[PDB]
Amino acid sequence: TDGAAGLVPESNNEVMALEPVAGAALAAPVTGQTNIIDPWIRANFVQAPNGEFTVSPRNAPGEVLLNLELGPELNPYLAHLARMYNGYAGGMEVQVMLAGNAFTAGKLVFAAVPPHFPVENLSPQQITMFPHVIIDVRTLEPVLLPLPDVRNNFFHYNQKDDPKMRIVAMLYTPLRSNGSGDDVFTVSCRVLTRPSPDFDFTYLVPPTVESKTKPFTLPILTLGELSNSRFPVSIDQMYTSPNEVISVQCQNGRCTLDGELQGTTQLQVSGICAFKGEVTAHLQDNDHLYNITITNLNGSPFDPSEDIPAPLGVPDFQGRVFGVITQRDKQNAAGQSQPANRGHDAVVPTYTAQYTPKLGQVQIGTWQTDDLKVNQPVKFTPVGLNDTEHFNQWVVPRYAGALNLNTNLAPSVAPVFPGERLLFFRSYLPLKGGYGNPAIDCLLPQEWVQHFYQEAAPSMSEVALVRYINPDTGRALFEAKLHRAGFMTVSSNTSAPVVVPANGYFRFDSWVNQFYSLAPM
Amino acid sequence: VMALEPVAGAALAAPVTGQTNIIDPWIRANFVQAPNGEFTVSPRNAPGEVLLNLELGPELNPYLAHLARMYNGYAGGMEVQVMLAGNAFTAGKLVFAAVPPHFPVENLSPQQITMFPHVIIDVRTLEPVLLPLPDVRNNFFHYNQKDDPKMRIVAMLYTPLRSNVFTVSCRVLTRPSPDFDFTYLVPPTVESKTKPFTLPILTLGELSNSRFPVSIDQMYTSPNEVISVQCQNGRCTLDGELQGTTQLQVSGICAFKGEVTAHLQDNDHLYNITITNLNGSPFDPSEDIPAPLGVPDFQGRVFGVITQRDKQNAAGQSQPANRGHDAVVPTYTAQYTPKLGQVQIGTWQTDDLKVNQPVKFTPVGLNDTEHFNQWVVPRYAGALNLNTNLAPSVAPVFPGERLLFFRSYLPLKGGYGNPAIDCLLPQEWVQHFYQEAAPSMSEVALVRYINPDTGRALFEAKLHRAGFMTVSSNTSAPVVVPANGYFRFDSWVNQFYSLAPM
Amino acid sequence: VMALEPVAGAALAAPVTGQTNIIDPWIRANFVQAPNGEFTVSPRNAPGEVLLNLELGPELNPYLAHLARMYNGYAGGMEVQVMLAGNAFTAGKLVFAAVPPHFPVENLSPQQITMFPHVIIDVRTLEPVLLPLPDVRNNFFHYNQKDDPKMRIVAMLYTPLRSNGSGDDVFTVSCRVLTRPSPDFDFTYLVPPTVESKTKPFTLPILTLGELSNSRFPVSIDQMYTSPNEVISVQCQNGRCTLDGELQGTTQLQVSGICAFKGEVTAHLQDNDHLYNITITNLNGSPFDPSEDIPAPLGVPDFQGRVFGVITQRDKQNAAGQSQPANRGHDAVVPTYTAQYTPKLGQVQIGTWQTDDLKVNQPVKFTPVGLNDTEHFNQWVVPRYAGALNLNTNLAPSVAPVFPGERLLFFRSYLPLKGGYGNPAIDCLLPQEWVQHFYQEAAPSMSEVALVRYINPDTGRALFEAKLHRAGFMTVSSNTSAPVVVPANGYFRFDSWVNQFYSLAPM
Amino acid sequence: TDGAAGLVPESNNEVMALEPVAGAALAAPVTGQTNIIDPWIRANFVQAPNGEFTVSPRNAPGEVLLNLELGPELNPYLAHLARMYNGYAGGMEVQVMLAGNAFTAGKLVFAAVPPHFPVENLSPQ
Ligand SMILES: [Zn+2]
Ligand SMILES: [Zn+2]
Ligand SMILES: [Zn+2]
């Protein structure tokens, strides 16, 4: 009050033109129990899981900075309480703290959008056709907004087929500043929620049984415990994307945060860059080549009319993968009816016309060792690459050879905010011979893929804001954006190994959108 | 029929707390089954053994166990009811008593348990009986982190129970007394000591072996001459403690890395190697470990590939050179001493290795089945040294039970055979137990293998606190299952629970 | 304000205690600065950084910490006052939360600290704010002996600092925390003063660098020397004693007992040099039980090398001179890297250059001087105390600086030789006088790290600061390895107990 | 008042917790004359001979910036008057003007130390 010298506006005197809407007392004669809530949660403002957003000079006017659907997932206490109830009815109370510096100048607009109205293409003047309020970014005392639960039935259920009343923020001015120094004056804003007096839960169910109420969590695993999801080795370091790479497409190690596997991704660590089949041919060139009818990795025949580009776990890059193939006979030739065994080196070229794993054929090679039976089962175990000839890790091989197209591919991913590049997890691979130091970068570790598949929690936004925490210092090193497609982006200008301690971990902070300005590394 | 004084709740602790919260009144309506409310009574039991031991807490109710992850303390009592399931031919009686906080219950006679507040019931009954469990204490309230003793319910057989094989199934259902309340709101799901125990929902085609880096293909019951095992990779309690040479990464099992420091000559060129840790740290043999985490823990001849990348880039002018060849690590011989810090290898008639250059091992399988006995832990310091800091040996104690394994088949290089590596837990279970690290409310858990389409449980086993599973079977055979089955945590039991025959 | 209900104090404990004591009313008014109550907020910080982590108790107020050594117990809360130093052309916010006793505060999110009783204050606030720190417990009062956890109060950066700088230095908000007792704080029961342990405060002796001495060899201290780049984790066996006064390894109390042994002679051989195998007892005269939990008898050397010294012999029976026994004393060398130096088994072998004058079966006494030569001189290798056929058991743990950018701080002392070329030195962690003072005082450690400062006596200002750990070693925040150039008549002064997250000023 | 735009604190509202101490009227029955002082010197603030000190960014926190012993040499008029008297009894009144710029930020602490207490090694707490 007295600390600010009269340089900023102290309070906002403007209301939304909304009517008092009924809550859960309307739903009383048709529901079952009408449970209650602890009175400390009712009367204290707590930061929402959609809490953080920033206004920056990189933002253009007319961008949607905030889009809050009504629910019990707007409060971190109600989000834990709502996992043992069946439904709800009622509104919330939202508080926005946006007290910026005294040298900046900008304005924001908040509006109330009805249930079945589309929000995807609002102009800056269409948002003034709703009950709205205009707030500048220098106000000291925080503003209060309603969220009144307009509906046409008695209460809601935990199903996803009823649209609800939203609040929508938009940038309304360019956020200029007339400070004398060239210093960062980017405004940091917070959103704090508490339930209305007319809010209640409905009906006690078993806890943590229903979907639609599971929360998103990250596992606490350090960088030394992570594993690569494109090759069966361990993760060495993190490494930013070069200026030539702007979008990637790599069918292994891909999973959305909702828990959907895409491309040829699977869950087993041992099944990456590996296959299993039956030798059907013999080719006598300078080197020895064989044809293998591959199956799935569990022991079932591979149907080519499945909705996948390849059998799950095949190599997804151009190169020459080096490994060891082994044989075990289906019959019993000798030794108390024990089968005999052979195991030799191999090489799988994936850029040629003989690597068509969607059709069913994978052709390998062994150098000058033609000791391999026909019509016996085989298994491939990858070690690395034999040479860096024709090694490009960002080109997808043709899974049906030439004269065909790849189908059901996972989509490409790229950053969109200005000044941001991709953040990879880099492991260095062994070679058989030659000069090189190759590397394979993955989007996600394999443990995160398994965790996202087991939890199957929904996503309340498109981007999640994480931070890299050093546990021996207790101070955050950098922050990043975890996208719903399953990739991370950072705000940097170089391409270099990120030098961090290897016993640090990522911590989930908040849900943001695609206009959040990251802090520069 | 009991008679005790009325005992206060958390309203006594009002002037020394912060918030004075309340609770949902609809939780006091239904009786909900306890998370450790399963026990059986059989005519193989005798009066004198304690069949049930329930300590008072918020974990006796699945709604209070969910609410207790956002609060800090509690005080108050709970109400208990018990159901039995027996026909008219059973003939016995069973007694339930209320035992104070600091009383020793070790070898109580059945005629001494009647000197408490008690009830006695016939087994041929059809109605559930009620047990009041108050909260006697000499402090103001309880914390969720410190653990002082509390008031119990102790069950025991009272008459032999001659039944004219037939196992009576009993269940416990609890609900909170009206004087129960919590203390102080905290961030939810961040304290320990209130996290419930769960298993991952993963099918058998998604789990990998924890002793050799390959996949699991079938379950197996232990043979008759194998009565106790002691392995080092894959040892983990249900609390999250990693014992032995156990780590979390799948890609590092039976693997190591270091420097080539010496050279010997024989039929096959040899190459002595000084090893380090897998993360890249110098190994100190003054730690309390058997050996470097992840080294092989059985006696055999491990066949793999050794790769070498140089440390200077002189050849080629921008990048360093690369050498990769096969290897054998014999773990039964005299020069396999990873505790001391040296592991010797062998390549057949191939000499292209360079000394003082960093290397790496990648296991593929074995090559020869001679000296392959997978239940001997090798001498990690050679001779003239006892193995220190080993993981304890595990063995069933109930009559008729044997070990359930997770079998996986290994690739050989040459010769004849079909070897098999058996493990206790999969690697994903070890990972889950390390991340969640929920406490153990008892010593033995109870799981069931479930067909997920119909919901029917196919068989059941006993998952112990030490990290192993035992079934009740008479033969040694593969377990035949549907393709999408998994395990599910059911209850916490004691050592007197009789399993259904497999 | 923080949503907290009133909590009872020492008036709750009235019908279960016997004396009804009061204190001075002037202490209940003055605001005294907390011992670790200061922090600065910088533009480099990120949201979610913990800044205070204070805790309730009589150790906040140095008047109550002096009165607490007369009484038997206490109960009650305090009043906290937070001041800031900013101006009107700034932006940023802080949060102050109230954490219960048994709740672990370990890397909390900035969202998760809003789920406590909290206030959110801007960095522009002109007036100092007042927070309550109540005494939540599940008993009637606390005892001065039995320690139990108490309610903490935690500060955290909520929103980063936005300001424009002045020049080559950026703006910085500095904060101070002051406390005073609540009107319901009180003590319980008058006892004799300074009798009970657990109330004794930790101090350091006022001895300068010229008056102290080495703890791994009986030589005086020469200088201070930061650890090299290839030295990251040491493990010695002499000079090891925790701040609570527990002697670890083979550490004893006497200065003259370092690298010294005593016992009888049993054997004689002469392959080249004279050998004289020697059985050993303790340094007081008791037979050494080899099954003791100690790694070796207390005061044997703890490094590889060839310790050159003088061995004397005084025989039991009186041969001549009217019942006065005879004497002899020569030079010898004990090598510690060979397979003959087994003090855990009970045998130490010496070596004498061509002097066959040492009678067997008469007791001896070794007095070390220096080294034989710099051959096999590795001062950071623990010798095999049982030779071969056994490994070293029950040692002291290894110590290492875990903070990014910190090195160990040693006490360097040079050493004489018998012959040859070199300038060797023995580095120790703590002096012997610090070990003796910590053993005699036995004051408890309130935290895991203590903060000390080197003091120049004529100006009274600090030259550098270091972190004294509970295990008995010091670390400084320096990036080189060089002798520390300070005046020789300086000493250290104990400042406060800090956390494991205190960043030292760069040296 | 109005020239500073509300950018700086205008006044300090804090006292030291000291009691009223007697002066030279206590010493009357044992002394000789009890002389007096010109009333213009009594009611006007004059700069002390220890008058000037600065706070700078070169200063470390915890430095003693000011140490005033009681005497008649704290006033330039009393220091000239005191050269013809034998003794004194009583206190003084000190005024510190420290009105700095509106962009700076710092704090000072002033304390009252008894007669026979050592001041050479005070910590900030
Ligand atoms: Zn061929
Ligand atoms: Zn050779
Ligand atoms: Zn001799």
Automatic annotation (TrEMBL), chain D:
<protein>
    <submittedName>
        <fullName>Viral protein 1</fullName>
    </submittedName>
</protein>
